[PDB]
Design an enzyme around this catalytic site. Structure first.
Site, PDB file in Angstrom:
ATOM      1  N   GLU A  35     -13.924  -4.931  -6.963  1.00 52.71           N
ATOM      2  CA  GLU A  35     -12.776  -4.031  -6.836  1.00 52.71           C
ATOM      3  C   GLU A  35     -12.914  -2.762  -7.664  1.00 52.71           C
ATOM      4  O   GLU A  35     -12.636  -1.670  -7.144  1.00 52.71           O
ATOM      5  CB  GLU A  35     -11.457  -4.708  -7.254  1.00 52.71           C
ATOM      6  N   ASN A  46      -4.953   5.220  -0.584  1.00 49.79           N
ATOM      7  CA  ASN A  46      -5.070   4.686   0.791  1.00 49.79           C
ATOM      8  C   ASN A  46      -4.414   5.651   1.787  1.00 49.79           C
ATOM      9  O   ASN A  46      -3.649   6.554   1.407  1.00 49.79           O
ATOM     10  CB  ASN A  46      -4.491   3.285   0.857  1.00 49.79           C
ATOM     11  N   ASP A  48      -2.207   5.005   4.002  1.00 49.02           N
ATOM     12  CA  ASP A  48      -0.762   4.711   4.012  1.00 49.02           C
ATOM     13  C   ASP A  48       0.059   5.334   2.871  1.00 49.02           C
ATOM     14  O   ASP A  48       1.290   5.054   2.804  1.00 49.02           O
ATOM     15  CB  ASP A  48      -0.614   3.171   4.054  1.00 49.02           C
ATOM     16  N   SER A  50      -0.314   4.747  -0.300  1.00 54.32           N
ATOM     17  CA  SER A  50      -0.370   3.924  -1.534  1.00 54.32           C
ATOM     18  C   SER A  50      -1.721   4.171  -2.233  1.00 54.32           C
ATOM     19  O   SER A  50      -2.661   4.758  -1.711  1.00 54.32           O
ATOM     20  CB  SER A  50      -0.138   2.451  -1.267  1.00 54.32           C
ATOM     21  N   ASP A  52      -4.412   2.145  -5.234  1.00 51.86           N
ATOM     22  CA  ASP A  52      -4.869   0.933  -5.936  1.00 51.86           C
ATOM     23  C   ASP A  52      -5.194   1.357  -7.378  1.00 51.86           C
ATOM     24  O   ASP A  52      -5.823   2.373  -7.602  1.00 51.86           O
ATOM     25  CB  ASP A  52      -6.032   0.221  -5.260  1.00 51.86           C
ATOM     26  N   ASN A  59      -2.103  -2.651  -5.786  1.00 51.58           N
ATOM     27  CA  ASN A  59      -1.511  -1.695  -4.844  1.00 51.58           C
ATOM     28  C   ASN A  59      -0.077  -1.294  -5.139  1.00 51.58           C
ATOM     29  O   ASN A  59       0.785  -2.133  -5.433  1.00 51.58           O
ATOM     30  CB  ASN A  59      -1.654  -2.316  -3.446  1.00 51.58           C
TER      31      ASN A  59
HETATM   32  C1  LIG Z   1      -7.704  -3.088   2.898  1.00 52.53           C
HETATM   33  C2  LIG Z   1      -6.860  -1.857   2.441  1.00 52.53           C
HETATM   34  O1  LIG Z   1      -6.830  -0.906   3.337  1.00 52.53           O
HETATM   35  N1  LIG Z   1      -6.210  -1.729   1.224  1.00 52.53           N
HETATM   36  C3  LIG Z   1      -6.772  -2.761   0.216  1.00 52.53           C
HETATM   37  C4  LIG Z   1      -5.382  -3.388   0.092  1.00 52.53           C
HETATM   38  O2  LIG Z   1      -4.965  -4.191   1.231  1.00 52.53           O
HETATM   39  C5  LIG Z   1      -5.123  -4.090  -1.250  1.00 52.53           C
HETATM   40  O3  LIG Z   1      -3.683  -4.158  -1.464  1.00 52.53           O
HETATM   41  C6  LIG Z   1      -3.466  -5.352  -0.749  1.00 52.53           C
HETATM   42  O4  LIG Z   1      -2.526  -4.731   0.205  1.00 52.53           O
HETATM   43  C7  LIG Z   1      -1.903  -5.739   1.040  1.00 52.53           C
HETATM   44  C8  LIG Z   1      -1.218  -4.942   2.082  1.00 52.53           C
HETATM   45  O5  LIG Z   1      -0.097  -4.200   1.667  1.00 52.53           O
HETATM   46  C9  LIG Z   1      -0.940  -6.556   0.186  1.00 52.53           C
HETATM   47  O6  LIG Z   1      -0.469  -7.736   0.877  1.00 52.53           O
HETATM   48  C10 LIG Z   1       0.898  -7.744   1.136  1.00 52.53           C
HETATM   49  O7  LIG Z   1       1.459  -8.329  -0.036  1.00 52.53           O
HETATM   50  C11 LIG Z   1       2.866  -8.624  -0.027  1.00 52.53           C
HETATM   51  C12 LIG Z   1       3.100  -9.169  -1.358  1.00 52.53           C
HETATM   52  O8  LIG Z   1       2.653 -10.467  -1.539  1.00 52.53           O
HETATM   53  C13 LIG Z   1       3.267  -9.587   1.093  1.00 52.53           C
HETATM   54  O9  LIG Z   1       4.656  -9.934   1.200  1.00 52.53           O
HETATM   55  C14 LIG Z   1       2.714  -8.998   2.473  1.00 52.53           C
HETATM   56  O10 LIG Z   1       2.909 -10.196   3.296  1.00 52.53           O
HETATM   57  C15 LIG Z   1       1.236  -8.577   2.420  1.00 52.53           C
HETATM   58  N2  LIG Z   1       0.820  -8.056   3.379  1.00 52.53           N
HETATM   59  C16 LIG Z   1      -0.218  -8.699   3.946  1.00 52.53           C
HETATM   60  C17 LIG Z   1      -0.263  -7.962   5.298  1.00 52.53           C
HETATM   61  O11 LIG Z   1      -1.012  -9.641   3.709  1.00 52.53           O
HETATM   62  C18 LIG Z   1      -1.690  -7.116  -1.119  1.00 52.53           C
HETATM   63  O12 LIG Z   1      -0.585  -7.591  -1.895  1.00 52.53           O
HETATM   64  C19 LIG Z   1      -2.594  -6.113  -1.831  1.00 52.53           C
HETATM   65  N3  LIG Z   1      -3.032  -6.429  -2.818  1.00 52.53           N
HETATM   66  C20 LIG Z   1      -2.893  -5.961  -4.076  1.00 52.53           C
HETATM   67  C21 LIG Z   1      -3.957  -6.710  -4.887  1.00 52.53           C
HETATM   68  O13 LIG Z   1      -2.245  -5.122  -4.733  1.00 52.53           O
HETATM   69  C22 LIG Z   1      -5.710  -3.425  -2.515  1.00 52.53           C
HETATM   70  C23 LIG Z   1      -6.338  -4.551  -3.296  1.00 52.53           C
HETATM   71  O14 LIG Z   1      -7.229  -5.403  -2.515  1.00 52.53           O
HETATM   72  O15 LIG Z   1      -6.848  -2.555  -2.232  1.00 52.53           O
HETATM   73  C24 LIG Z   1      -7.044  -1.819  -0.973  1.00 52.53           C
HETATM   74  O16 LIG Z   1      -6.277  -0.934  -0.834  1.00 52.53           O
END
Ligand SMILES: CC(=O)N[C@@H]1[C@@H](O)[C@H](O[C@@H]2O[C@H](CO)[C@@H](O[C@@H]3O[C@H](CO)[C@@H](O)[C@H](O)[C@H]3NC(C)=O)[C@H](O)[C@H]2NC(C)=O)[C@@H](CO)O[C@@H]1O
Length: 129
Positions: A35, A46, A48, A50, A52, A59
């Site tokens: 990461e 990102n 969107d 947001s 990281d 995020n």
């Molecule tokens: C792949 C990308 O374009 N961005 C990577 C990104 O996805 C990571 O942030 C992850 O983002 C997802 C999407 O918003 C987050 O997952 C969500 O978390 C919520 C909290 O638990 C849930 O209620 C939603 O259900 C869920 N959405 C999904 C669709 O699964 C996730 O929490 C998040 N992670 C972090 C860690 O902050 C970050 C880190 O991998 O980097 C990239 O941007």
């Protein structure tokens, strides 16, 4: 700060990350490496709107407030800026909160991609922890 792999391993172990929500230490060292390359100051914007933040690349859409993210919820109740300090306390407390959601450590794209189902022995080899 750019942490050394074993230095990070010791700080995580010391902070109760080994086994947190069933995730052994090597899980946490592997995702930090992929990461952010162990840099607490890492940031990635990102598509969107947001961003990281930090060693764990947490995020801004769900976990911290950076004041420029559309539809942000700030579940860790922090400023994203607190995730960039050399001191890992706030980052660790927020990563502990992130793993309690349903998706667990699968919340991290880099874990899914480079650590899941892998041999992670190498991430803590030689650390003496
Ligand atoms: C792949 C990308 O374009 N961005 C990577 C990104 O996805 C990571 O942030 C992850 O983002 C997802 C999407 O918003 C987050 O997952 C969500 O978390 C919520 C909290 O638990 C849930 O209620 C939603 O259900 C869920 N959405 C999904 C669709 O699964 C996730 O929490 C998040 N992670 C972090 C860690 O902050 C970050 C880190 O991998 O980097 C990239 O941007």
């Amino acid at each position: 700060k750019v942490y050394d792999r074993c230095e990070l391993a010791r700080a995580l172990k010391a902070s109760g990350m080994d086994g947190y929500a069933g995730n052994s230490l090597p899980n946490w060292v592997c995702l930090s490496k992929w990461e952010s390359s162990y840099n607490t100051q890492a940031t990635n914007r990102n598509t969107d709107g947001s961003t990281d933040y930090g060693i764990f690349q947490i995020n801004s859409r769900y976990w911290c407030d950076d004041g420029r993210t559309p539809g942000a919820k700030n579940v860790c109740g922090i400023r994203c800026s607190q995730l960039l300090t050399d001191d890992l306390t706030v980052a660790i407390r927020c990563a502990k909160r992130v793993v309690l959601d349903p998706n667990g450590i699968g919340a991290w794209v880099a874990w899914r991609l480079h650590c899941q189902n892998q041999d992670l022995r190498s991430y803590v080899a030689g650390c003496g922890v």
